[PDB]
Amino acid sequence: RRRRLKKVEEEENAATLQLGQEFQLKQINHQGEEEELIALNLSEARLVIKEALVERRRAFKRSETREKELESIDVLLEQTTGGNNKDLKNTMQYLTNFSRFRDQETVGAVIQLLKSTGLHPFEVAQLGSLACDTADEAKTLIPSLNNKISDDELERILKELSNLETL
Amino acid sequence: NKDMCPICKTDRYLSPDVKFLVNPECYHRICESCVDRIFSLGPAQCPYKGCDKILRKNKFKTQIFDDVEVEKEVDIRKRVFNVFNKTIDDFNGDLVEYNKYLEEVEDIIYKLDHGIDVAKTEEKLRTYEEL
Amino acid sequence: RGPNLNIVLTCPECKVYPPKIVERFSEGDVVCALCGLVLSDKLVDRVGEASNPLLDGNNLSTRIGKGETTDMRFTKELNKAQGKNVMDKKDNEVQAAFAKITMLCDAAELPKIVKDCAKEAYKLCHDEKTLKGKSMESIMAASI
Amino acid sequence: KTELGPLIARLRSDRLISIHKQREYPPNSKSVERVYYYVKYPHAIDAIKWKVHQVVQRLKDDLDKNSEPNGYMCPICLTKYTQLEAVQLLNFDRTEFLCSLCDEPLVEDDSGKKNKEKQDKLNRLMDQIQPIIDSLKKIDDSRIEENTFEIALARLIPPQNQSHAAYTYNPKKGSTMFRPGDSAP
Amino acid sequence: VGQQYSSAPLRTVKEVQFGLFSPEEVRAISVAKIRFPETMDETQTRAKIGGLNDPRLGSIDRNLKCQTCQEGMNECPGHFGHIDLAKPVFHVGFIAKIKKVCECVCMHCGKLLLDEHNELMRQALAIKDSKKRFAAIWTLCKTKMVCETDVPSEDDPTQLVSRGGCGNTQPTIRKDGLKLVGSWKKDRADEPELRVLSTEEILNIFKHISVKDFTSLGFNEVFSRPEWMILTCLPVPPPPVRPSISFNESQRGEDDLTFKLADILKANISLETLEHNGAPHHAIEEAESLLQFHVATYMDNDIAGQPQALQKSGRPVKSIRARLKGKEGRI
Amino acid sequence: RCSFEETVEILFEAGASAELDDCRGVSENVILGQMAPIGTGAFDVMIDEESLVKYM
Amino acid sequence: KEKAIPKDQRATTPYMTKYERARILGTRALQISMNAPVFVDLEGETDPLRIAMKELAEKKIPLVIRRYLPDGSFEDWSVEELIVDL
Amino acid sequence: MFFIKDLSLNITLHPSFFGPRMKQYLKTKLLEEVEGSCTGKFGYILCVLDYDNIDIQRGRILPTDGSAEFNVKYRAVVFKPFKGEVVDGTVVSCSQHGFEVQVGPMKVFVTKHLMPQDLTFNAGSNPPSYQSSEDVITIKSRIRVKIEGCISQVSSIHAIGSIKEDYLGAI
Amino acid sequence: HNQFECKGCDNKIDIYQIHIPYAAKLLFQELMAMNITPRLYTDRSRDF
Ligand SMILES: [Zn+2]
Ligand SMILES: [Zn+2]
Ligand SMILES: [Zn+2]
Ligand SMILES: [Zn+2]
Ligand SMILES: [Zn+2]
Ligand SMILES: [Zn+2]
């Protein structure tokens, strides 16, 4: 490491896919191994968070419709989380009310679908998080997609995503 | 209206990097700086005297031809050909029918270009894209 | 017509307003007299110069003089350059008037308070439209 | 002299006029360092071009800035707060923006209606400054040679019959001394 | 009571990197610009805005808050101001270094007088440690009185290899007071020409020196450049550095640093007004010399051969160097 | 070095040369008000969880 | 972690130094005074320093000394395994 | 956006927890000091992944404090906003200055200047709401907001979004 | 308000707090006035 002073840094902006310095595409994990930036859509984040919560509950104990899921999530959260969990409660409620894929089968299908285009993790997460009906809507809501994927492929991918929607 | 943006009057001499873009909605010349400043937040009315047609930043493109009339005609031709697209084999080699079809397509393009029957022509395009 | 920038010491526990405050200078503390809670600690009690903001107002200036080693050329040139200042010229008239007042009072064997009051009166009454055509001798004598 | 002072000083700062000091030895009087004023066309043209570009750029940047949202101001401490900086100071009731130093409601900033005024100013300025642009185009088309005291003396029209100043350039022999900005290509 | 809790991580100082402020860094760091040589307004009730004791620079009173951080006297560390000098001035503590660098580099193009084409200069440049490398380079270069546009090639002395130069004869630089005076030696046909090397000229020459050129001399491209040894923006220390003492609290006393800063501001304003209109070169030179002397005494009031700044009481003015040195100093 | 003599000259030279000080010295740690690496400070005291678990 | 010398090749003295003993006793006394769990039976004691001395005598101080070397490397020595003979 | 990030923290343990079960106290402190917290560098730290395998490094006793500083490496799910990114949320508060949409653990404030001209503020209706010919925006409404600006503090994040662009606003 | 800012560097999440003598702070400020930049860093840049 050499000397360091004021340097010009590219302002963070999703349009240019410049996520900053701590959210680069190429990350290093705690074991020193190289990895790609893990970006999760709303449904994937919901499932991962709930998996971690159930694992935590199992550890401590050892040693459907939107309303029912919301009630179960709230009670499990309060039981298996400590104080100052207002943000986590709001996050769980928002994820449950804004998710489009409920089960691991649907989420895995979405992943195996959207990993074909080879877009940025942020872009694929945006496509899996925002419900778009037309390629123009997707283009306007995700400016970075411009000049990266053709309207034909985008239309087919969006159609399949809408096809495999829950309920 | 020779080498400067009519809105901001940015001369190429003082801005050698200035690049002018065009919008198919009204085909009015405008510089990238004006486009960014006026349409970054969202759609807005065209910044021209006598033009009140809204346009989006994403629709801007680079002018190919130096003649605005020919650019308009060619763009409308592209839009038409994206719908009326047939080959000689489509009529089993019937040159008379193919020629009549080409004449009809040219007449439609002319009508769109000169605004003869905009409503009827657009409805016909919409129907034929379905069929 | 400006930011408050005021600090008021009050005891959070007592809540009494105004509070009874004791300044323990020896212990360097400010303590609530009722409950004993300390409100502020590490209170503070030649490197500078003193001035009277009644006869000179706000005017900070420094002289130039010889040192343990110095060349007369630099002192002379620097004093010459310092003399040719436009902003300081205006107050130099008041300073010269003060000097003449001091000389007159000292030759009159008057107490220090007399000459201080004379200088204050001269400063207060100077730079006004009414006293523009009168001799400086008359002005100084009236002030004295 | 006092009136001439500001004019010469401003023109020298803008580099529309160059200065040249030299020692002159009259045959029957004490020598005196006389000051001559002339125009160095390349430097003057460069200064004019840069200033015109800077003025136009300043107006364009002002237009771009004005196109941005207004902001907020504090009447008491007279502090400006951007929209982003003000969004983090709102009260718990989510009703009004409160200042940090004063804890007082903020007031919306001005410049909302000047959007057209700045564009009008730019439109006026370009039309008024049109001649300079054309002259600069012709100058760029041509090539100009830098002027010097001696070169300018070749076109001299004597001001007075018996002017005390000796309008001659007699450089010292074998003088290797070089002064800043005293040489030309 | 103690100081208020902070959310920033608590760490221990492990390294100290010294350097010189750039004018851009001074302007960026500064929270306010000081343009009035006064301390209080006409009412003597609150500090004048833009004056020496601007409230934005901090507070030295137990009753007032800082207009910048809104913290008390026991928590505000002090915030720096700045004064934009009318003309660049030398740093009193770097005059000798500036003179050595001037003798080492050309005064018309900023290129080292001796390149890697000389064996002695190669040996000098081969020294690892910056201080002794600079000493050797200065010893070799100070005797070169010409830029040597063309130099013999290292393969053989038959042909000459061209190097970037100007062919201008270098001057002999001498230190007269707080000024640098250069003497150019004439040709056969006779006394040498003499003139004062303006601070602006030296600043331009130093700014024309290349990164490698001054890295060889020992200056750091990132933390210390030769151009930064000349002051264009003077930082103004906050009131905590120069507190206003009180004897009976009915009479107000100001620090010697405050007095000197007021003198600097007055001299700068005088020079600006002069050079703005008229002000023949003689008057401009006198004003520039006054400003340089005031800055030099503000940073160090004990300069050999120069007059000392004296207050009305007649005692020498206490400078920052005086505060730092001695058995009773900061260290 | 400035703590002994020629304080201001040494500091100016350090600033000009962009010197880096590693704060390995007692004088540096004294100026910065941190525990110098001398005597009781020449080592770091860390907690032993392996022994904590076995101390009951 | 190339700066951590493995336990099999430690070359420092196996005897606790006076400075190490002083710092260990002071740190343990501070922890005890701040209501830390004591792992040694007390036959009646109120001085944290005396309690720490008892803990050191019985080798019940859960602290490890990280001895530093001039090159930046270090060796970890447990108080239990460090001989107290001074 | 939601990301899985590998983070490191410095936890301080009081001497009162230097018992045979200090690791459990460290894990509890992590769950009480990280979960639900906001950092400018990594966003809102929502959940800690792999709660059974947090990497706890050797602790260092502070010189004078007497506490133990442990370097704890863990993997957590963090929500980091970015300007130019489109999100969906629910309006929680409305006022003349604009409405505040709740997106996960964050709140995006929509200024009036960043709203379409047709939308206007109306305090007559209870609760106060914005009414336009095509749609009405009020509390509990679903709004698609494009983040226009973000200001990140060491322990705070605030964002401003817009709904003027096409295909934004009420969902 | 739990806010930090270093104007000039345009950063708000890279601040550290250190405990030093007020005399040391005064010395550093005096050097800053004298145009010397004592920069305190909490991490090492060169190996022993
Ligand atoms: Zn334009
Ligand atoms: Zn138009
Ligand atoms: Zn009380
Ligand atoms: Zn305010
Ligand atoms: Zn402050
Ligand atoms: Zn040269």
**E83 Cα to the center of ligand 5, angstroms:** 19
Question: Is there a contact between G13 and G33 (Cβ–Cβ < 8 Å)?
Answer: no
Residues H49 and H104 in one domain: no
Interface residue H114 vs chain B (CB under 8 A): yes
Looking at residue B56, which CATH number applies to its domain?
Answer: 3.30.40.10
Nearest to E318 by CA among E256, E244, E240: E256
Burial of residue A115 (number of CB atoms within 10 Å: 0-12, 13-18, 19+): exposed
Which one, of F15, F4, I24, C47, lies nearest residue E325 by Cα? F4
What is the DSSP code (8-state) at residue E91? Answer: -
Q: Phi and psi of E174, rounded to 5°?
A: -130, 150
Q: How far is residue D101's CA from residue E235's CA, in Å, rounded to a whole number?
A: 26
User: For chain C, which chains pass the contact test of at least 3 CB pairs under 8 Å?
Assistant: D, E
Please name which of E242, E269, E241 lies closest in space to residue E258, comparing C-alpha atoms: E242
The domain total for chain H is 2
Instruction: Compute φ and ψ for H94, nearest 5 degrees.
Output: -135, 145
Q: Report how many domains make up chain G.
A: 1
Q: Which residues make Cβ contacts (< 8 Å) with residue A150, sequence separation at least 6?
A: none
- Amino acid identity of residue I21, one-letter, is P
G73 to chain I, closest Cα gap in Å: 10
Do H61 and H94 lie in a common domain? no
Q: Do H63 and H88 fall into the same domain?
A: no
Residues H108 and A94: their CA atoms lie apart, in Å, by 14
Given the DSSP bridges, would you call strands H156-162 and H106-111 parallel, antiparallel or unpaired? parallel
Q: What stretches of chain H adopt beta strand conformation (E)?
A: 2-13, 37-39, 43-49, 55-56, 60-61, 68-79, 86-95, 98-103, 106-111, 120-122, 129-131, 136-137, 142-153, 156-162, 169-170
Ligand positioned closest to the Cα atom of D80:
4
- The alpha carbon of D142 is separated from its chain's Cα centroid by a whole number of angstroms, namely 25
Query: Tell me, what DSSP letter sits at residue A67?
Result: H
Task: Compute the distance between CA of residue G74 and CA of residue D62 in angstroms, rounded to an integer.
Answer: 61
Look up tokens 């500078």; give the residue.
C48
User: How would DSSP label each residue in H64-108?
Assistant: TT--EEEEEEEEEEEE---TT-EEEEEEEEEETTEEEEEETTEEE
The two structure tokens encoding residue E117: 């084409």
Yes or no, beta carbons of H47 and A82 under 8 Å apart? no
Identify whether residues H48 and H90 lie together within a single domain.
no
Nearest-ligand number for the alpha carbon of E67: 5
* SS3 (DSSP) at H138: coil
C41 interaction partners in chain E (CB closer than 8 Å): 1-2
Q: Which of residues 4-63 of G touch F (CB under 8 A)?
A: 19-20, 22-24, 26-27, 39, 60, 62-63
The CA dihedral of G7, G12, G18, G23, to the nearest 10 degrees, is -40
Q: How many CB atoms lie within 10 A of CB A11?
A: 10
G9 CB neighbour count, 10 Å cutoff: 7
Domain boundary among the residues H82, H102, H120 is at: H82
Question: Distance, CA D115 to ligand 2 centroid (Å)?
Answer: 19
The answer on whether E104 is annotated among ligand-binding residues is: no
Long-range contacts of C99-104 (CB under 8 A, 24+ apart): C100/C136, C100/C140, C101/C140, C101/C143, C101/C144, C104/C140, C104/C144
**E8, H154: Cβ pair inside 8 Å?**
yes
Which among H19, H52, H82 is the end of a domain? H82
Could you tell me if H25 and H95 lie in one domain? no
> Of the candidates G18, F20, E157, C76, which has an alpha carbon nearest to the alpha carbon of residue I47?
F20
Resolution, rounded to a tenth of an Å? 3.2
**Domain shared by H97 and H169, yes or no:** yes
Cis upstream peptide for C18 (omega within 30°): yes
Cβ count within 10 A of residue E250: 7
What is the sign, positive or negative, of the torsion defined by CA atoms of H118, H120, H124, H127?
A: positive
Angstrom distance (rounded) from CA G31 to CA G63: 11
Q: DSSP per residue over chain B, as a string?
A: --SB-TTT--BTTT-TT--EEE-TTT---EEHHHHHHHHSSS-EE-SBTTB--EE-GGG-EE--SS-HHHHHHHHHHHHHHTTS---GGGGTT-HHHHHHHHHHHHHHHHHHHHTSSHHHHHHHHHHHHH-
B39 → chain H, closest CA residue:
H165
F16 CA distance to ligand 6 middle (Å): 24
Same domain, H107 and H151: yes
In eight-state DSSP terms, residue E43 is T
Q: What is the CA radius of gyration of chain H?
A: 21
Using an 8 Å CB-CB cutoff, list chain D residues near C4: 101-102
Instruction: Report the relative pairing of strands H60-61 and H68-79 from DSSP bridges.
Output: antiparallel
Buried b (16+ CB within 10 A) or exposed e, B57-82: beebeeeeeeeeeebbbebbbeebee
**A142 interaction partners in chain H (CB closer than 8 Å):** 86
Ligand 3 centroid to Cα of residue C38, in Å, is: 8
Q: How was this structure determined?
A: cryo-EM
Among A78, A41, A31, which Cα is nearest to A57's? Answer: A78
Q: What is the interface size between E and F, counted as CB pairs within 8 Å? A: 64
With beta carbons under 8 A apart, name residues in chain E contacting A5: 222-223
* Neighbouring subunits of A (3+ Cβ pairs under 8 A): B, E, H, I
Domain that includes residue G47, residue range: 1-86
- Give the domain extent around H23: 1-82
Burial E126-157 (b: 16+ CB within 10 A, else e): eeeebeebbebbbebbbebeebbeeeeeeeee
Domain end (from H82, H102, H121)? H82
Q: How many CB atoms lie within 10 A of CB A12?
A: 19
Residue D102 token pair: 């004063």
The verdict on H101 and H71 lying in the same domain is no
Residues with CB under 5 A from ligand 2 (ion): B 26, 28, 46, 48, 51
Query: For D9, which of E184, E186, E277 is closest by C-beta distance?
Result: E277
Q: At what angle do helices F7-17 and E130-141 cross, to 10 degrees?
A: 80
C-alpha–C-alpha distance, residues A83 and A76, integer Å: 14
Domain of residue B53 covers: 4-62
What is the rounded distance in angstroms from the CA atom of residue E234 to the CA atom of residue B9?
Answer: 41
Q: What value, to the nearest 5°, has the Cα angle with vertex C52 and ends C46 and C55? A: 145
Write out the two tokens for F53.
């678990």
Q: Which chains lie within 8 Å of chain E at 3 or more CB pairs, if any?
A: A, C, D, F, H, I
- C-alpha distances in Å from residue D80, one per residue of D86, F29, H43, I1: 9, 43, 27, 18
Rg (CA), chain B: 19
Handedness of CA D144, D148, D154, D157 (dihedral sign): positive
Do H88 and H65 have their domain in common? no
